[PDB]
Write a protein that binds this DNA or RNA. Structure first.
Ligand SMILES: Nc1ncnc2c1ncn2[C@@H]1O[C@H](COP(=O)(O)OP(=O)(O)OP(=O)(O)O)[C@@H](O)[C@H]1O
Ligand SMILES: Nc1ncnc2c1ncn2[C@@H]1O[C@H](COP(=O)(O)OP(=O)(O)OP(=O)(O)O)[C@@H](O)[C@H]1O
Ligand SMILES: Nc1ncnc2c1ncn2[C@@H]1O[C@H](COP(=O)(O)OP(=O)(O)OP(=O)(O)O)[C@@H](O)[C@H]1O
Ligand SMILES: Nc1ncnc2c1ncn2[C@@H]1O[C@H](COP(=O)(O)OP(=O)(O)OP(=O)(O)O)[C@@H](O)[C@H]1O
Ligand SMILES: Nc1ncnc2c1ncn2[C@@H]1O[C@H](COP(=O)(O)OP(=O)(O)OP(=O)(O)O)[C@@H](O)[C@H]1O
Lengths: 362, 362, 362, 362, 362
DNA sequence: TTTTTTTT
């Protein structure tokens, strides 16, 4: 008897697991009889219940091995390797088409037979989101395409407006949608430059809590951030490759992704002010609060943060042909499901009632 | 014959140990004949006497082996792996339910037949805490709910007041109850980077003693804390994942825990102010001051500053329906024990005594 | 049977792959039968489909190995060794031939078997270059000469002027044609090392804007950039070898390479400019915006940024006799393939579109 | 045959050896034929001469081992592991009892058959110390009880006075008695981060000659100390765990020890002074000076610094009930030896000699 | 056949080598034919020619090994381990006794028939040194015992006098005789910590050329060092341990060693004058200058700097009883040699020449 | 290999 490292690796690939402890912990669960595995019986997690019986025999033999972390290290490296092969070979539009398939597979579960969530609330989110700004689903489709075509030095959108104006609210959902990362500008230039090292393979990025100096005219308590933007204006423009930090591995050089950054109106150089392809003002909108104070399940469940909310909004608005091609198979089968659950009058009722500043329902 | 590595791992699972030297040291103790083991006979540490007989046979072989630290390292990473799996897959509520079972177990010891402390002194403790604030037990129910829901931008509580107001005490009790960590931010901006790394995978965190600036006009010597947290809104808001590191380790990326901030009274900007949900004023009460000086076992056993006392307070005051369904059986047991162990009127009198600043007991 | 480590090492030098993760990922693909490999059938990536059938047998056995990552580390060390050998042995001419020898291959990709592009656009890009003066084609060749004919102080070109002077686009383009790296300055002197240590064992180095003082009459921010330059004699005029410290790290010593410094208009402590090949002063021109306004594709495809344009600038303007002996024949072939598209009247037609910034497809 | 790793571990255990090189060097001393060992015959060093004969056979085989440092590292791990296990599971009273056992063992060796130190000279130092403060022995027992109980916030004593006051003399004695480390707080505010790292697992700490502020009238050098202490009030309070750091070590977390602060007569802010239980002001004493000047053997053998001197004072002054039962057996035997050796007339005469400032002896 | 790791280690012991690379290089040379060895035949280095004969047999096999560097590591560990055992167990008298044995080994070679240097010239050194200060030979013996007895407070010596007054010449010879280190304390206080770090496990220290305030009154360039020393009482007094730091390493705890201080006539605080045992005035003496002009071979061979020069002086001037009993056998032989080598009258003529300012030899 | 250091 000896461990099949191949079967271990196949789980890691099918899981797309890329943490060595996470995989180690995960695989050890399979050593017991799936026949009475309460997790399986509960259909507790798909990462478990889909795989327990398949891997049982190997996991029992793995459970006794003396090499366990070394086994897992090779498996995790194949996953990172696959990511990087894709990362350089694939088209940006092609990448997106794979990301969507990931999210659809989750919705299969979320609203499955184990329909643990329920779509009523999520469409109310779509309504509330589609209340926030004009042509909402368009400007999504617009920024979506912008990030695919990646026109050099047309690469970033920006937002401004008071605290709680919702700009973070928009931003977070866009990031959950695409995948990507968010980072902090304002830390000192050493820590800064290491932090940039997270950008590897990220299709898209954001920065939060960014500061300029001197916003105190707007009463804004102020700080460094703008300085460290200006340091990276080639990253911004993506004009070039640039190097990216690591620990215990070489720093690696490549071109830098596009995206969005959080601001409110501190000072900022005009080489930035004139630079960017887009910006939007977030203005607070009281009737949202007066729905929200009722509809608080939205926040508890992070529905308004969900990228799945955005996808549902696009599935709601746009015609099937407007999406990338192969997904249109599944788009229709979701378009179907929307028709089945929702008449227009459902969403009509929802958004109207909401728009009056009432709680979500009557 | 050979050492079973599996048996060592199982002991680490059973103890939930995760320091290689603690594991190594403790496992070596088993090598003597458990038959005669003085520590067993004294019944001194359950981490030992519940396991010595079981592990004896394998501890003798471990005492010979040339690999000892390697065997221990595997087991510790197994426990850490388990933590990461749990962290990624339990509901916030289940984590707390697990944590509460651990405290109930320690209480079954502390007031078990071994009775290493007096349940009456511990209940005397609870009275002093209940006295400390308006609607104390309702206040605690609020805080647990807040930490469990973890609602975006509604994650932080601010204790403020004068010196010796008890705010640190209350934080330390809440901290132990949920099992957070404590963090300093009156620190240099560079090594600050490694400080926050502690907070990886914690349920809760607390920021101590956040020193303001211009404070010495008010006799409070100015310091970095406020000048520092004002650059960390991303972390507090918990709205998007943020990245964390440790020495010789690459960055994790996760949401930041909810938590508490403590200060003596300092000026706070609208920005940071907007990101706390509740703030609480504490003020000295000379009758409490006197009573501790009589009842000083409250300090010496640190009774007034343990989650055990808060857990007890919740048990006495809250309906069993307010507990998660899984644990409710043990709650009924302990409620019945306590309602049997103490009348209302003893508790009534304790409050009168403590309100009257005399030593607690008569 | 066993993995041939030799075969893996061949593929690294054939593909010139020099990342262990990429190498591992690429190579793992070959374990499926090339016979039916859809990537091969679709002929998407030569780095795949050229090699699959050869490596398939070895790849299957590799995919089974326990030791896979170390096989790849040795293979990547092989390529790193070759590069280090060449970087020491050859002359700047030979090295520059080896570039042009396969910027040639870029032509064979840019106009590769797909009908990869229409060279019209590329010379429209080249034509957009030559616009500060009709001298500029010489200045390319003259700069290239200064690089091979490197003499002390005959090292650094002061590329002087405000935004949108194109200087950075050009610097980036040369950093593709020749290679080299780009760098910053306005630092404390230790951090300036931790910056400049990037330059280890390289042949061409480029730099960005530097703070003088007192220039706020042209709104130029004062600072300590110029202050560091007065200290950098041992590098700037550079007659004698000097060390190349990265922070705490790789303290190489040699002659520091030549290249280009980019900065705005600023005052002149002549102590500095004395060390330079140049003081060449640039400004934007209004009509050039109105060209770009109407020639947008030449930015969109990065044609204007690519060093490829500089090859074809040189292929146009410089007579074949000026090129290195073995490429001259290929220069004829791209003077042929120039004339396979271009009369000088079309070149002039495009110049005279630009003469008032007419859309250059005219 | 083969090296017993177990025997090496036992030697490390019995010598309580912390250090891998010290262990290596020691063990190699045994490789030479036991019966001729001059170190044994000269009875030079019990750490050698007790063990040589037993370990001899394995030491010779160890001398051949190709693996020597690995064996020592494993052995040192078990000694380190023991300390960490004890640190968690011991009562603070038990720790102190163990520390006393070790000092009492050193006192056997000093005054035993080896005749190596003069019990009469040592007793003179107790007389000089019992003069140094009012009620001197009472202060020691209170300090011991203070440090055993470790009451939150009520954890630190402040020593104040001029130069040549004796305060660091007394602090050093209490530190050797208990075990612990001094610390210097006058450092730059970065290196505090590593300076405090020394506190890990200690039983006491001493902050040495904290520099305050102003006070050129006071004729005191200024420094960081006082204000920088206030920035660490948490570590005084000890109410909650803190995070501590050593070079190359990832952080470990503990309650910061109780201890002593020493300073000249600077001003102190009560934000800090609220955290001192008790304050002792020393005075210069002419008769002590003139006594010491004629009692130089006290200093020439460091008697009045040494922890053994304080232990001898407690044995003389304190009833046997004040000691923990385990050592009451040994305490009684030492009391017998002292009352055999001395008389109260003698001790009073010594104290009178100190009071008269003559040499202690007459 | 196998390599003897033992034979390598024995060589490392006897060379007292502690650099892994240096040990490696030396041993590899023995692989060449010992019987023909040119380095042996020319008697170039004793560390080679004494050993090549024995180790050649093993060196041949060493040259084939693949473990070469790890063999050297274990060898060098053995030397370092020996030094640790020594430092923690020898008496300071035994420590000195070893270093004299080492110096006498060197002298045995220098004044040999093939290893050769001029026993006549080196005695001109002692004549010159014995003129630099009255009762020179006794002063050395006094200083020596002072360093050995290391009595608290009685620990430190002050050298005072103008530039070019010989104080550092004499200090250097003492430091060579005793194996200490120099330290410079004119730094600003915060930087001193790594300076003081140098002292770890050293026998002596010399504080070089301390600058005071107010020197400009006498054109002495002024500086901090005086005030820094006044701030270091505990290091000087040497009564109690202090903690010392080296780069990357964690702290060491030890008595700060005894030593020497040198200065021009800066005004010395009364506080410092209490610290020093001994003040020596160094003054320019015009006759020594003219003697040096006429006998520069003293400078050219560095004779007057050498601890070997001082050791010769002690051997000439001090009774055999002054030396430690164990070394006296070598001393008597060296006395016998010098008794043969010089009449007293020839030596006395040299003194008369030195007093005459004439060249030492005639 | 980082970390510590460096410098702050
Ligand atoms: N348009 C809006 N009007 C009123 N409240 C809003 C609006 N958008 C968001 N909110 C409230 O603000 C909270 C925080 O939203 P968000 O973080 O996106 O705002 P923000 O403008 O980006 O804030 P900040 O600049 O402080 O980070 C939301 O959870 C919601 O309760
Ligand atoms: N209401 C009160 N009146 C007087 N003393 C109090 C009161 N509550 C607590 N104390 C005392 O305050 C001491 C310290 O409490 P705690 O550390 O929690 O206060 P704090 O305000 O957080 O202090 P700090 O500002 O020092 O951090 C307690 O040990 C208790 O003796
Ligand atoms: N002479 C010019 N007139 C107008 N626009 C120009 C000119 N040269 C370049 N541009 C355009 O200006 C934009 C920026 O070009 P580029 O970065 O090369 O200029 P730069 O002078 O080096 O700028 P910076 O100093 O801001 O880095 C590009 O879109 C480019 O096409
Ligand atoms: N009370 C005293 N009266 C007179 N001389 C004293 C007294 N205490 C100590 N001495 C003398 O002073 C020397 C140094 O004592 P010590 O180091 O404790 O002084 P200190 O001024 O209190 O020190 P620190 O400022 O470092 O705490 C002693 O060795 C002794 O010679
Ligand atoms: N006592 C002396 N009389 C005359 N010349 C002297 C005397 N001592 C030293 N010399 C001359 O001074 C030179 C330097 O001597 P040395 O370095 O010991 O002087 P120093 O005063 O201790 O110097 P520094 O203060 O610079 O360290 C010697 O090489 C010699 O030429």
């Amino acid at each position: 008897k000896q461990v099949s490292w191949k079967l271990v690796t196949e789980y890691a690939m099918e899981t797309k697991c890329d943490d060595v402890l996470l995989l180690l912990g995960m695989y050890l669960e399979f050593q017991y009889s799936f026949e009475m595995c309460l997790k399986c019986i509960k259909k507790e997690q798909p990462s478990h219940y889909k795989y327990h019986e398949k891997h049982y025999a190997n996991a029992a033999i793995f459970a006794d091995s003396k090499n366990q972390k070394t086994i897992c290290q090779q498996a995790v490296d194949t996953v990172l390797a696959k990511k990087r092969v894709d990362s350089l070979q694939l088209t940006r539009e092609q990448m997106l088409t794979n990301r969507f398939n990931d999210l659809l597979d989750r919705m299969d579960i979320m609203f499955g037979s184990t329909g643990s969530a329920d779509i009523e609330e999520w469409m109310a989110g779509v309504a509330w989101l589609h209340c926030l700004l004009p042509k909402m689903d368009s400007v999504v489709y617009d920024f979506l395409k912008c990030m695919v075509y990646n026109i050099p030095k047309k690469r970033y959108w920006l937002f401004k407006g008071p605290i709680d104006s919702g700009k973070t609210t928009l931003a977070a959902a866009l990031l959950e949608l695409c995948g990507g990362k968010a980072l902090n500008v304002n830390l000192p230039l050493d820590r800064l430059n290491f932090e940039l090292g997270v950008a590897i393979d990220q299709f898209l990025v954001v920065f939060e809590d960014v500061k300029g100096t001197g916003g105190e005219s707007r009463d804004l308590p102020s700080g460094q951030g703008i300085n460290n933007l200006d340091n990276l204006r080639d990253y911004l423009d993506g004009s070039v490759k640039v190097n990216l930090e690591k620990k215990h591995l070489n720093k690696r050089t490549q071109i830098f992704p596009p995206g969005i950054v959080t601001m409110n109106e501190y000072s900022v150089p005009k080489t930035l002010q004139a630079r960017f392809v887009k910006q939007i003002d977030f203005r607070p909108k009281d009737y949202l609060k007066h729905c929200l104070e009722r509809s608080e399940f939205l926040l508890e469940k992070r529905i308004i943060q969900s990228g799945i909310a955005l996808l549902l909004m696009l599935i709601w608005y746009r015609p099937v042909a407007e999406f990338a091609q192969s997904i249109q198979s599944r788009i229709v089968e979701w378009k179907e499901r929307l028709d089945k659950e929702f008449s227009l009058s459902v969403y009509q009722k929802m958004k109207f009632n909401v728009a009056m500043g009432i709680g979500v329902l009557d």
